[PDB]
Coordinates of C-alpha atoms and ligand atoms in Angstrom, one line a residue:
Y1 CA 13.6 9.1 -11.6
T2 CA 12.2 11.3 -14.6
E3 CA 11.9 14.7 -14.0
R4 CA 8.2 14.9 -15.3
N5 CA 7.1 17.6 -12.6
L6 CA 3.4 17.5 -13.0
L7 CA 1.8 19.6 -10.6
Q8 CA 4.3 22.3 -11.1
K9 CA 3.6 22.3 -14.7
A10 CA -0.2 21.7 -14.3
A11 CA -0.2 24.8 -12.4
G12 CA 2.6 27.0 -14.1
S13 CA 3.8 29.0 -10.8
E14 CA 2.9 29.6 -7.0
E15 CA 1.4 32.7 -8.8
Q16 CA -0.8 31.3 -11.2
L17 CA -1.5 28.5 -8.0
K18 CA -2.4 31.6 -5.7
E19 CA -5.3 33.0 -8.0
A20 CA -6.6 29.2 -8.5
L21 CA -6.7 28.8 -5.1
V22 CA -10.6 28.5 -2.8
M23 CA -10.0 31.0 0.1
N24 CA -12.4 31.0 3.2
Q25 CA -12.8 27.4 3.3
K26 CA -15.6 27.2 0.7
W27 CA -13.9 23.9 -0.9
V28 CA -15.7 22.0 1.2
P29 CA -17.3 19.8 0.0
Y30 CA -19.7 18.3 3.1
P31 CA -22.2 20.3 4.6
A32 CA -22.5 22.8 7.3
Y33 CA -22.2 21.3 11.3
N34 CA -25.4 23.4 11.4
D35 CA -27.3 22.1 7.8
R36 CA -29.1 19.3 9.4
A37 CA -31.5 18.5 6.7
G38 CA -27.8 18.4 4.2
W39 CA -26.2 15.6 6.7
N40 CA -29.6 13.8 6.8
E41 CA -30.0 13.6 2.9
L42 CA -26.1 12.9 2.7
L43 CA -25.9 10.1 5.7
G44 CA -29.0 8.1 4.9
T45 CA -29.1 5.0 6.6
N46 CA -25.4 5.7 8.0
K47 CA -26.8 8.3 10.5
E48 CA -27.9 6.1 13.2
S49 CA -24.8 3.5 13.0
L50 CA -22.7 7.0 13.3
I51 CA -24.5 8.5 16.3
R52 CA -24.1 4.7 18.0
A53 CA -20.5 4.7 17.7
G54 CA -20.6 8.2 19.6
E55 CA -22.7 6.8 22.4
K56 CA -19.7 4.4 22.9
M57 CA -17.4 7.4 23.3
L58 CA -19.8 8.9 25.7
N59 CA -18.2 7.3 28.6
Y60 CA -14.5 6.8 26.8
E61 CA -11.7 7.7 29.6
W62 CA -8.9 9.0 27.9
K63 CA -5.5 7.7 27.9
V64 CA -1.9 9.2 29.0
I65 CA 0.4 8.1 26.5
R66 CA 3.5 7.2 29.6
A67 CA 7.2 8.2 28.8
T68 CA 8.0 4.7 29.4
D69 CA 5.5 3.9 26.2
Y70 CA 7.7 6.2 24.2
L71 CA 11.1 5.0 25.6
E72 CA 10.3 1.4 25.4
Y73 CA 11.2 1.9 21.3
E74 CA 14.5 2.7 22.2
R75 CA 14.9 -0.4 24.9
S76 CA 13.2 -3.0 23.3
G77 CA 11.6 -1.9 20.0
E78 CA 8.7 -2.2 21.1
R79 CA 5.9 0.0 19.7
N80 CA 2.4 -1.4 20.7
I81 CA 2.5 -0.3 24.3
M82 CA 2.8 3.2 22.9
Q83 CA 0.5 3.1 19.6
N84 CA -2.5 1.0 21.3
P85 CA -3.3 3.8 23.7
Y86 CA -3.2 6.3 20.9
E87 CA -4.7 5.0 18.7
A88 CA -7.5 4.4 20.8
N89 CA -7.3 8.4 21.6
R90 CA -7.5 9.1 18.1
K91 CA -10.2 7.2 16.9
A92 CA -12.4 7.9 20.1
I93 CA -12.4 12.1 18.6
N94 CA -13.0 10.8 14.9
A95 CA -15.9 9.0 16.1
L96 CA -17.2 11.5 18.3
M97 CA -16.8 14.1 15.2
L98 CA -18.3 11.6 13.0
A99 CA -21.5 11.0 15.4
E100 CA -21.7 14.8 16.1
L101 CA -22.1 15.2 12.2
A102 CA -24.7 12.8 11.8
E103 CA -26.7 14.2 15.2
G104 CA -25.9 17.5 15.4
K105 CA -27.8 18.3 19.2
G106 CA -24.6 19.0 20.8
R107 CA -24.4 15.6 23.0
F108 CA -21.0 14.7 22.0
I109 CA -19.7 18.5 22.0
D110 CA -17.7 17.8 25.4
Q111 CA -15.7 14.8 24.6
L112 CA -14.5 16.8 21.5
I113 CA -13.6 19.2 23.7
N114 CA -12.0 17.0 26.0
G115 CA -10.0 14.9 22.9
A116 CA -8.9 18.5 21.7
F117 CA -7.5 19.6 25.2
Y118 CA -6.2 16.1 25.7
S119 CA -4.6 16.5 22.5
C120 CA -3.2 19.7 23.3
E121 CA -1.7 18.8 26.6
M122 CA 0.1 15.7 24.7
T123 CA 3.7 16.5 24.1
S124 CA 3.6 15.6 20.8
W125 CA 1.3 13.6 17.8
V126 CA 4.4 11.2 16.6
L127 CA 4.5 7.6 16.9
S128 CA 7.4 6.9 19.1
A129 CA 9.5 4.4 16.2
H130 CA 9.3 7.8 14.2
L131 CA 10.5 10.0 17.3
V132 CA 14.2 9.5 16.6
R133 CA 14.2 11.7 13.6
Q134 CA 14.4 14.7 16.3
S135 CA 18.3 16.6 16.2
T136 CA 18.7 14.3 19.5
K137 CA 17.1 11.0 17.9
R138 CA 15.8 9.8 20.8
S139 CA 12.4 8.0 21.3
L140 CA 10.7 10.7 23.7
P141 CA 9.2 13.5 22.7
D142 CA 10.9 16.6 23.6
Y143 CA 9.1 19.4 24.3
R144 CA 11.2 21.4 22.1
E145 CA 11.1 20.4 18.4
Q146 CA 8.2 19.3 15.8
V147 CA 8.6 16.2 13.3
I148 CA 6.2 15.5 11.2
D149 CA 5.5 12.0 10.9
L150 CA 2.5 9.3 9.3
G151 CA 0.9 9.8 12.6
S152 CA 1.0 13.3 13.3
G153 CA -0.2 13.9 9.8
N154 CA -3.8 12.2 10.2
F155 CA -4.0 13.6 13.9
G156 CA -3.5 16.9 12.7
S157 CA -6.0 16.5 9.6
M158 CA -8.4 15.2 12.4
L159 CA -8.1 18.1 14.7
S160 CA -8.3 20.6 11.5
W161 CA -11.8 19.2 10.5
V162 CA -12.7 19.5 14.4
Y163 CA -11.9 23.1 14.7
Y164 CA -13.4 23.8 11.6
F165 CA -16.7 22.2 12.4
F166 CA -17.0 23.0 16.5
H167 CA -14.9 26.3 16.9
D168 CA -18.1 28.0 17.1
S169 CA -19.4 25.3 19.8
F170 CA -16.2 25.3 21.4
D171 CA -16.3 29.3 21.8
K172 CA -20.0 29.3 23.6
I173 CA -18.2 26.8 26.0
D174 CA -14.9 28.8 26.2
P175 CA -13.2 30.8 23.5
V176 CA -9.7 29.3 24.7
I177 CA -10.3 25.7 23.4
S178 CA -10.4 26.8 19.9
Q179 CA -7.7 29.2 20.3
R180 CA -5.6 26.8 21.8
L181 CA -6.1 24.0 19.1
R182 CA -5.6 26.5 16.6
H183 CA -2.0 27.6 18.1
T184 CA -1.1 23.7 18.5
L185 CA -1.7 23.1 14.7
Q186 CA 0.0 26.2 13.8
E187 CA 2.6 24.7 15.9
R188 CA 2.7 20.6 14.9
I189 CA 1.9 20.8 11.3
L190 CA 1.9 24.5 9.4
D191 CA 5.5 25.5 10.7
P192 CA 7.7 22.7 10.7
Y193 CA 6.4 21.7 7.1
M194 CA 7.7 25.2 6.3
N195 CA 10.4 25.2 8.2
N196 CA 12.4 22.2 8.2
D197 CA 13.3 21.2 4.6
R198 CA 15.1 18.1 5.2
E199 CA 12.2 15.7 6.7
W200 CA 13.4 12.7 4.6
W201 CA 9.8 12.1 2.7
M202 CA 10.0 16.0 1.5
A203 CA 12.6 14.7 -0.6
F204 CA 14.4 17.9 -1.1
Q205 CA 17.4 16.2 -0.4
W206 CA 16.9 13.5 -2.6
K207 CA 19.6 11.4 -5.1
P208 CA 19.9 8.7 -6.9
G209 CA 20.0 5.4 -4.4
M210 CA 17.6 7.2 -1.8
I211 CA 13.7 6.1 -1.5
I212 CA 10.7 7.6 -1.9
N213 CA 7.5 5.9 -1.3
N214 CA 4.1 6.2 0.5
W215 CA 5.2 8.6 3.3
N216 CA 5.6 11.2 0.4
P217 CA 1.9 11.6 -0.8
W218 CA 0.7 10.3 2.3
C219 CA 2.4 13.2 4.5
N220 CA 1.9 15.7 2.1
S221 CA -1.6 15.1 1.5
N222 CA -2.1 15.4 5.5
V223 CA -0.2 18.3 5.1
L224 CA -2.3 20.0 2.2
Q225 CA -5.8 19.4 4.3
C226 CA -4.3 21.3 7.9
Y227 CA -3.3 24.5 5.2
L228 CA -6.4 24.6 3.4
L229 CA -8.4 24.4 6.3
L230 CA -6.9 26.8 9.1
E231 CA -4.9 29.7 6.8
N232 CA -6.5 31.9 5.8
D233 CA -4.0 34.6 4.3
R234 CA -3.5 33.6 0.6
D235 CA 0.6 34.6 0.2
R236 CA 1.2 32.1 3.0
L237 CA -1.3 29.3 1.6
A238 CA 0.1 29.6 -1.9
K239 CA 3.8 29.7 -0.7
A240 CA 2.6 26.4 1.0
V241 CA 0.7 24.8 -1.6
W242 CA 3.5 25.0 -3.5
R243 CA 5.6 23.4 -1.7
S244 CA 3.2 20.7 -0.9
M245 CA 3.2 20.5 -4.7
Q246 CA 7.1 20.0 -5.4
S247 CA 7.1 17.8 -3.0
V248 CA 4.8 15.2 -4.0
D249 CA 6.3 15.9 -7.9
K250 CA 9.0 14.2 -6.8
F251 CA 6.9 11.3 -5.7
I252 CA 4.8 11.5 -9.0
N253 CA 8.9 11.4 -10.6
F254 CA 10.1 8.5 -8.8
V255 CA 7.3 5.7 -9.6
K256 CA 7.2 3.6 -12.9
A257 CA 5.4 5.4 -15.6
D258 CA 3.4 2.0 -15.8
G259 CA 1.7 2.3 -12.9
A260 CA 2.3 -1.0 -11.4
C261 CA 2.9 0.0 -7.4
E262 CA 6.5 -2.0 -6.3
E263 CA 5.1 -2.3 -2.6
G264 CA 2.4 -4.5 -4.3
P265 CA -1.5 -4.7 -3.4
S266 CA -0.8 -4.7 0.1
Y267 CA 0.9 -0.8 0.2
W268 CA -1.5 0.3 -3.1
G269 CA -4.0 2.3 -0.8
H270 CA -1.2 4.2 0.8
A271 CA 0.6 5.0 -2.0
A272 CA -0.9 5.7 -5.1
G273 CA -4.1 5.8 -2.8
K274 CA -2.5 8.4 -1.0
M275 CA -1.3 10.2 -4.0
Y276 CA -4.7 10.3 -5.3
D277 CA -6.0 11.5 -2.1
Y278 CA -3.6 14.4 -2.1
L279 CA -5.0 15.0 -5.8
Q280 CA -8.8 15.2 -5.2
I281 CA -7.6 17.1 -1.6
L282 CA -5.5 19.8 -4.2
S283 CA -8.2 19.5 -7.3
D284 CA -11.0 20.6 -4.6
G285 CA -9.1 23.1 -3.2
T286 CA -8.4 24.5 -6.8
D287 CA -11.8 24.7 -8.0
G288 CA -10.4 21.5 -10.3
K289 CA -7.6 24.0 -12.2
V290 CA -5.1 22.0 -10.6
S291 CA -5.4 18.2 -11.9
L292 CA -3.6 15.4 -13.4
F293 CA -6.9 13.3 -13.0
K294 CA -6.7 13.4 -17.2
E295 CA -3.4 11.8 -17.1
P296 CA -3.1 8.0 -17.8
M297 CA -0.2 7.3 -15.7
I298 CA -2.6 8.6 -13.0
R299 CA -5.3 6.5 -14.0
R300 CA -3.3 2.9 -14.4
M301 CA -1.5 3.6 -11.0
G302 CA -5.3 3.5 -9.9
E303 CA -6.0 0.3 -11.9
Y304 CA -3.3 -1.5 -10.7
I305 CA -5.7 -2.9 -7.5
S306 CA -8.0 -4.5 -10.3
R307 CA -5.3 -6.4 -12.1
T308 CA -4.0 -7.5 -9.1
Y309 CA -6.9 -9.4 -7.2
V310 CA -7.6 -12.8 -8.7
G311 CA -10.6 -13.7 -6.9
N312 CA -12.2 -14.4 -3.6
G313 CA -9.6 -13.0 -1.7
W314 CA -6.7 -13.8 -3.2
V315 CA -4.1 -11.3 -4.6
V316 CA -0.8 -11.4 -6.9
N317 CA 2.0 -11.4 -4.3
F318 CA 4.9 -11.3 -5.1
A319 CA 7.8 -9.7 -2.5
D320 CA 7.1 -9.8 1.6
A321 CA 3.3 -10.0 1.0
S322 CA 0.0 -11.6 1.8
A323 CA -1.3 -13.6 -0.5
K324 CA -5.1 -12.6 0.8
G325 CA -6.1 -8.8 0.0
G326 CA -9.3 -7.1 -1.2
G327 CA -8.9 -3.4 -0.6
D328 CA -10.8 -0.3 0.5
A329 CA -13.6 -0.4 -1.6
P330 CA -15.4 3.1 -0.7
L331 CA -11.4 4.6 -1.6
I332 CA -11.3 2.6 -5.0
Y333 CA -14.5 3.9 -6.0
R334 CA -13.5 7.7 -5.6
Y335 CA -10.2 7.2 -7.1
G336 CA -12.2 5.0 -10.1
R337 CA -14.9 8.5 -10.3
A338 CA -11.8 10.8 -10.7
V339 CA -10.1 9.3 -13.3
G340 CA -13.1 8.1 -15.3
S341 CA -12.2 4.3 -14.7
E342 CA -15.2 2.1 -15.1
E343 CA -13.2 -0.8 -14.3
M344 CA -11.8 0.7 -11.0
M345 CA -15.6 1.6 -9.9
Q346 CA -17.4 -1.8 -11.4
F347 CA -14.0 -3.4 -8.7
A348 CA -15.0 -1.8 -6.0
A349 CA -18.5 -2.4 -6.1
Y350 CA -17.7 -6.3 -6.8
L351 CA -15.4 -6.2 -3.6
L352 CA -18.5 -5.2 -1.6
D353 CA -19.9 -8.7 -2.5
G354 CA -23.1 -7.8 -2.7
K355 CA -23.0 -5.7 0.6
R356 CA -23.9 -2.2 1.3
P357 CA -20.9 -0.2 1.6
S358 CA -19.8 1.2 5.2
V359 CA -18.4 4.5 6.8
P360 CA -15.2 3.7 7.6
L361 CA -14.2 5.1 11.4
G362 CA -10.4 4.7 12.2
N363 CA -8.1 7.5 12.5
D364 CA -8.6 9.1 8.9
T365 CA -11.0 11.7 8.9
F366 CA -10.8 12.8 5.0
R367 CA -11.6 9.1 4.2
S368 CA -14.5 9.2 6.5
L369 CA -15.9 12.1 4.8
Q370 CA -15.0 11.0 1.6
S371 CA -17.1 7.8 2.1
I372 CA -20.1 9.4 3.3
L373 CA -19.7 12.0 0.9
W374 CA -19.5 9.2 -2.1
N375 CA -20.8 5.6 -0.8
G376 CA -24.5 6.3 -1.7
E377 CA -22.8 6.3 -5.6
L378 CA -20.8 2.9 -4.3
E379 CA -23.8 1.2 -3.6
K380 CA -26.2 1.6 -6.8
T381 CA -22.8 1.0 -8.7
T382 CA -23.2 -2.3 -11.1
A383 CA -20.2 -4.5 -9.9
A384 CA -18.2 -6.5 -12.1
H385 CA -14.7 -7.8 -12.5
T386 CA -13.7 -8.4 -15.8
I387 CA -9.9 -9.9 -16.1
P388 CA -8.3 -9.8 -19.8
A389 CA -6.1 -11.9 -21.2
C390 CA -3.3 -10.2 -20.4
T391 CA -1.5 -7.1 -18.7
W392 CA 1.7 -6.0 -19.1
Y393 CA 3.5 -3.2 -17.1
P394 CA 7.1 -3.2 -18.9
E395 CA 8.8 -1.0 -16.1
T396 CA 8.2 -2.7 -13.4
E397 CA 8.0 -6.2 -15.4
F398 CA 5.1 -7.6 -13.9
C399 CA 3.1 -9.8 -16.5
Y400 CA -0.7 -11.3 -15.5
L401 CA -2.6 -13.6 -18.1
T402 CA -5.8 -14.9 -18.2
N403 CA -7.7 -17.9 -20.0
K404 CA -11.3 -18.2 -20.3
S405 CA -11.4 -21.9 -18.6
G406 CA -10.7 -19.5 -15.4
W407 CA -6.8 -19.7 -15.0
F408 CA -4.9 -16.8 -14.0
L409 CA -1.1 -16.6 -14.1
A410 CA 1.2 -14.4 -12.8
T411 CA 4.9 -13.4 -13.6
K412 CA 8.2 -11.6 -13.0
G413 CA 10.9 -10.3 -14.4
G414 CA 12.6 -7.3 -12.3
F415 CA 15.7 -7.4 -9.7
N416 CA 16.8 -8.9 -6.2
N417 CA 16.5 -5.4 -4.5
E418 CA 12.5 -4.2 -5.3
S419 CA 10.6 -4.0 -1.9
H420 CA 10.3 -5.8 0.7
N421 CA 12.5 -7.7 -2.0
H422 CA 11.9 -11.4 -2.4
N423 CA 14.5 -13.2 -4.4
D424 CA 12.1 -14.2 -7.2
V425 CA 12.9 -13.4 -10.7
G426 CA 11.1 -14.8 -13.2
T427 CA 9.0 -16.9 -10.7
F428 CA 5.5 -17.7 -11.5
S429 CA 2.0 -18.1 -9.9
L430 CA -0.9 -20.1 -11.0
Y431 CA -4.6 -20.0 -9.7
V432 CA -7.1 -22.1 -11.7
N433 CA -10.8 -20.6 -10.7
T434 CA -9.6 -18.6 -8.2
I435 CA -7.8 -20.9 -6.3
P436 CA -4.0 -20.7 -5.6
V437 CA -2.8 -24.0 -7.3
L438 CA 1.0 -23.0 -7.6
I439 CA 2.0 -20.5 -5.1
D440 CA 4.2 -17.9 -3.8
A441 CA 4.6 -18.0 0.5
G442 CA 4.2 -14.4 0.4
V443 CA 5.3 -12.7 3.9
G444 CA 6.0 -13.9 7.8
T445 CA 6.2 -12.6 11.0
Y446 CA 9.0 -10.1 11.5
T447 CA 11.9 -11.3 13.3
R448 CA 16.0 -9.4 14.1
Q449 CA 16.6 -11.4 11.2
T450 CA 13.7 -9.9 8.3
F451 CA 15.4 -6.5 8.0
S452 CA 19.0 -8.0 8.9
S453 CA 21.9 -9.5 6.1
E454 CA 20.4 -12.9 7.6
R455 CA 17.6 -12.5 5.6
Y456 CA 18.3 -14.8 3.1
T457 CA 18.0 -17.3 5.4
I458 CA 14.7 -17.2 5.7
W459 CA 13.1 -19.7 3.2
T460 CA 10.0 -17.7 2.5
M461 CA 12.6 -15.0 0.9
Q462 CA 14.7 -17.9 -1.2
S463 CA 14.4 -18.6 -4.5
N464 CA 14.6 -22.0 -3.3
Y465 CA 11.0 -21.7 -2.3
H466 CA 9.1 -20.3 -5.3
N467 CA 8.7 -21.8 -8.7
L468 CA 12.2 -21.5 -9.8
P469 CA 15.1 -23.3 -10.9
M470 CA 18.3 -23.8 -8.8
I471 CA 20.5 -23.5 -11.4
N472 CA 23.4 -25.9 -10.9
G473 CA 22.5 -26.5 -7.7
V474 CA 22.5 -22.5 -6.6
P475 CA 19.7 -20.2 -5.8
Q476 CA 19.7 -16.6 -6.9
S477 CA 21.6 -13.7 -4.8
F478 CA 20.3 -10.7 -3.3
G479 CA 20.8 -7.6 -5.0
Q480 CA 20.3 -4.9 -7.2
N481 CA 22.1 -6.3 -9.9
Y482 CA 20.4 -9.6 -9.8
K483 CA 18.1 -9.1 -12.4
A484 CA 16.0 -10.3 -15.3
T485 CA 17.7 -9.9 -18.8
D486 CA 16.2 -9.8 -22.6
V487 CA 12.6 -9.7 -21.1
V488 CA 9.5 -10.7 -23.6
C489 CA 5.9 -10.6 -22.8
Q490 CA 4.0 -10.9 -26.3
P491 CA 0.4 -10.3 -25.1
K492 CA -0.9 -11.6 -28.5
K493 CA 0.4 -14.9 -27.8
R494 CA 0.1 -15.1 -23.8
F495 CA 3.7 -15.2 -23.4
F496 CA 6.3 -13.9 -21.5
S497 CA 10.1 -14.7 -21.3
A498 CA 13.1 -13.8 -19.3
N499 CA 16.8 -14.8 -19.8
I500 CA 17.4 -15.2 -15.1
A501 CA 20.8 -16.3 -15.6
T502 CA 21.3 -12.8 -14.1
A503 CA 19.9 -13.3 -11.7
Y504 CA 22.5 -15.9 -10.1
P505 CA 25.9 -15.3 -8.8
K506 CA 29.2 -16.2 -10.4
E507 CA 29.2 -20.0 -8.7
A508 CA 26.0 -20.4 -10.7
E509 CA 28.5 -20.9 -13.9
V510 CA 25.6 -20.1 -16.2
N511 CA 26.1 -18.6 -19.7
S512 CA 22.5 -17.5 -20.1
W513 CA 19.0 -19.6 -18.8
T514 CA 15.1 -18.2 -20.3
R515 CA 12.6 -19.5 -18.4
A516 CA 9.2 -19.0 -20.6
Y517 CA 6.0 -18.8 -19.9
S518 CA 3.1 -19.9 -22.6
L519 CA -0.5 -19.7 -21.6
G520 CA -3.3 -21.5 -23.6
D521 CA -6.8 -21.8 -23.4
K522 CA -6.6 -24.7 -21.5
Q523 CA -2.8 -25.6 -20.3
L524 CA 0.2 -23.3 -19.1
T525 CA 3.6 -25.0 -21.2
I526 CA 6.8 -23.9 -18.8
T527 CA 10.0 -24.1 -20.4
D528 CA 14.1 -23.4 -19.4
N529 CA 16.3 -23.1 -21.8
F530 CA 20.4 -22.7 -20.6
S531 CA 23.8 -23.3 -21.4
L532 CA 26.0 -23.7 -18.4
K533 CA 30.1 -23.4 -18.3
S534 CA 30.2 -26.0 -16.5
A535 CA 27.8 -28.9 -15.1
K536 CA 29.0 -29.2 -11.5
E537 CA 25.4 -30.3 -9.9
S538 CA 22.2 -31.6 -11.2
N539 CA 19.8 -28.9 -11.9
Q540 CA 16.7 -28.6 -9.6
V541 CA 13.4 -27.2 -10.3
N542 CA 11.2 -26.6 -7.6
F543 CA 7.1 -25.9 -7.0
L544 CA 5.2 -24.5 -4.3
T545 CA 2.0 -25.8 -3.8
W546 CA -0.8 -27.0 -1.2
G547 CA -3.7 -29.3 -1.0
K548 CA -3.0 -33.2 -2.0
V549 CA -0.3 -33.8 -3.8
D550 CA 0.4 -37.4 -5.6
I551 CA 3.8 -38.1 -7.4
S552 CA 3.2 -41.8 -7.8
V553 CA 3.0 -41.9 -11.6
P554 CA 6.1 -40.9 -13.1
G555 CA 6.5 -37.8 -15.3
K556 CA 3.6 -36.7 -13.6
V557 CA 2.3 -34.6 -10.5
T558 CA -1.3 -34.6 -9.4
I559 CA -2.3 -31.5 -7.3
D560 CA -5.9 -31.2 -5.9
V561 CA -6.8 -28.2 -3.7
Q562 CA -10.3 -27.1 -2.7
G563 CA -11.7 -29.6 -5.4
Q564 CA -9.8 -27.9 -8.2
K565 CA -7.4 -30.1 -10.3
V566 CA -4.1 -29.6 -12.3
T567 CA -1.5 -32.5 -13.5
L568 CA 2.1 -30.8 -13.9
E569 CA 4.1 -33.3 -16.4
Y570 CA 7.7 -33.3 -16.9
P571 CA 10.5 -34.6 -18.7
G572 CA 11.8 -38.5 -18.1
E573 CA 15.5 -37.2 -17.0
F574 CA 13.8 -35.6 -13.8
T575 CA 13.4 -37.8 -10.6
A576 CA 10.3 -36.1 -8.4
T577 CA 10.2 -35.8 -4.3
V578 CA 7.9 -34.0 -2.1
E579 CA 8.8 -32.0 0.5
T580 CA 6.5 -31.1 3.8
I581 CA 6.9 -27.9 4.8
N582 CA 5.2 -27.1 8.2
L583 CA 3.9 -23.3 9.1
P584 CA 4.0 -22.4 13.0
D585 CA 4.4 -19.1 12.1
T586 CA 0.5 -18.5 12.2
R587 CA 0.5 -14.9 9.8
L588 CA 1.3 -18.1 7.1
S589 CA -1.0 -21.1 8.3
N590 CA -3.7 -17.9 8.8
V591 CA -3.2 -17.6 4.9
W592 CA -2.0 -21.5 3.9
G593 CA -3.3 -23.7 6.6
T594 CA -0.6 -25.9 8.9
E595 CA 1.2 -27.1 5.8
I596 CA 2.7 -26.5 2.4
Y597 CA 4.5 -29.1 0.1
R598 CA 8.0 -28.2 -2.1
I599 CA 8.3 -30.9 -5.2
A600 CA 11.3 -30.8 -6.1
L601 CA 12.6 -32.2 -9.1
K602 CA 15.9 -32.9 -9.8
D603 CA 17.7 -33.8 -13.1
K604 CA 18.7 -37.1 -13.1
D605 CA 21.8 -36.0 -14.7
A606 CA 24.6 -32.6 -15.4
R607 CA 24.2 -31.3 -18.3
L608 CA 26.3 -28.2 -20.2
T609 CA 23.1 -27.2 -22.5
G610 CA 19.2 -28.6 -22.2
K611 CA 16.1 -27.7 -22.7
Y612 CA 13.2 -28.5 -20.1
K613 CA 9.5 -28.5 -20.9
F614 CA 6.5 -28.6 -18.1
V615 CA 3.0 -28.5 -19.1
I616 CA 0.1 -28.1 -16.7
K617 CA -3.3 -28.8 -17.4
Ligands
ZN1 ZN1 7.8 -14.7 -2.5

């Protein structure tokens, strides 16, 4: 945590903010509903696909979300029973809105009215799992209280746009529709935001040890759209926009300055990506007077999604994250354009893989509309993903290294209480021509143990199944104070090392253990350099991999995967075995196939001090 307060410094004060604010929704960057020519020019060939999406919803049947659909969360923790009809309802509305903007003949208005009307009858827009933050802590929506969550924020931003575009059309049919929708938005977004200081995601009660995360910018971004679209009293608007700036500053203050996403690439789009959206929304709402887009840290927070991307759908997957990824190109484009990152824009074009971008349907109206606005520029942008020799994130302690023969090495220092922590201090992952060769297993299906204190009985979470030693046969231990020390990165030598001794418990009986990586033009060198207090058990050095693994030759492990070969050479003191790891969990088997392997290298004798050297070529 660092007291940057970038937003508050950029605006100066509420009073200065109030003068910057753009009233009467003149900041809106889309064409008027009645500007058919404008919508045609902007949509191009997307027009037709949006209209056919609306035709599907012409006969959409609104679903009651049952009381028992909420009660289930309490009974059993099941959430899909509630989420599935809720999302269907919400997506129907968003697609009817996009279809009506594209066609503009009033043919979707009746169902828009139905969706708005139904939406005002629903007790709550909040997800069943998030309703336990009511006073009473019940999962059943309590008509006497309001809460704001991820779900209700999106639902509010969508209905605010529905109001903005269509209130005049609704009024021709019956003024009560608009009138009530406006009153509902006031009751469910606008008032609770201002009147309740204690929502955890707002972080006005934050103290060291408490989390701030994606919720903060995500919730705030939605709140801000609602205020900019509905609040036509300048004093009330400035007060609310100022509070959102103070809240989001909490998130910007908490993040690491090197710009790495600790949640990882799978979460980037809703963490730094929703911050970006919040900042777009605030910029447009202040005629660009309030902007952080020239700030390097905001740029680096964006480029992380480029640097973690290895190729052909593989991403760096430290912690409990998927090895597969390849994010929202339209999003990545817009972030890149805003911060002047050519890297980000080229990469968005690269993710399209020679295909035309699409307007997303989904439940995020801001992103649907912004994809309509900027997709045409994305479609013309020249594609590339040029990955530098070294990327070094010194606070987060991620290091990505690359050579000209198509090798990508990811390594980390860090600590064993990271987001979605794995016990993996000093681990590496190696890819050759985008093919994973020494691998990090990543995310499995959630069970009762996952978020319990039996978590580290799950093999994917254990240093045992990462590319690490078991020192005196002991793995790393969970905890904030199990960390790398003496962390070094020398970009010019493609070098990283960390004293990983301090990520092991006392039972490891280790004084120091330096794990070091040196990527040459055609090889990787790994070294382990250690002093133990007692030589109790043979050290065991483990490598995770897949494909065909051949340990027949002593001193050498050949790995063949998808026509890529590497050879791992190890010292004579070790004996090699290869253990099969079957993958019943399809969340893993969909990624790696039905089985992967652990290469176990067990030192023939215990030693007090020693140096192991591994070469992969
Ligand atoms: Zn892992």
